[PDB]
Design a protein around this ligand. Structure first.
Ligand SMILES: CSC[C@H](NC(=O)COc1cccc2cnccc12)C(=O)N[C@@H](Cc1ccccc1)[C@H](O)C(=O)N1CSC[C@H]1C(=O)NC(C)(C)C
Lengths: 99, 99
């Protein structure tokens, strides 16, 4: 699709068999999801945004569908204000910015 | 242009007679620039994201040339770690996300 930016670029994702809403975020290096259960071991990660830095849990090689497009990659879990689909997964789905 | 997302989508902007580097950010509702002077009246705003909120000054009817494309709109000024071009100005330069 071609997604314009007059509204937030919200999509449905599927992760853990569950549908969630998330934002396609070109300003985010990484993908950050609200507290949920994911399988496997996690590693510590600090990420920084507008307000400072937060601790999150890093899960690798997680199966995730984004707007119907299949991806498998790193998902961070933590106190994010919104579910964020960042560049690590935007690249997997072939997304570009165009103007 | 077509900007891939393998790296941060940074571009040069001109604002208030000054050149800056800024991030093209579909995840941001607003455009946020590091401390600088701008003309006109302003009002305070709190904006929130990863790590919480910061206080900024809101200036209306400001022009930013973004990678050669002129856009007018609201610009927030405050202690952001990165200059952010948000959706309010991305729309004006005709930016879309494509996949
Ligand atoms: C994976 S979540 C973390 C992410 N940060 C990054 O990708 C990169 O951060 C940084 C890059 C370089 C220097 C930095 C120094 N101090 C902190 C962060 C830095 C991030 O928060 N990105 C946001 C933009 C941004 C990038 C860099 C610094 C600060 C913010 C995001 O694209 C957005 O728009 N978000 C996510 S939460 C809501 C919204 C947002 O912040 N909106 C505004 C700007 C407050 C309107």
């Amino acid at each position: 699709p071609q997604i314009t930016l007059w509204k937030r670029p919200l999509v449905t994702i599927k992760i853990g068999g569950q549908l969630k809403e998330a934002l396609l975020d070109t300003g985010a290096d990484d993908t950050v999801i609200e507290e949920m259960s994911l399988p496997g071991r996690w590693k510590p990660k600090m990420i920084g945004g507008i307000g400072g830095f937060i601790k999150v849990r890093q899960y690798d090689q997680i199966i995730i569908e984004i707007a119907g497009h299949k991806a498998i990659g790193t998902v961070l879990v933590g106190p994010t204000p919104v579910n964020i689909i960042g560049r690590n997964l935007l690249t997997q789905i072939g997304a570009t910015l165009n103007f």
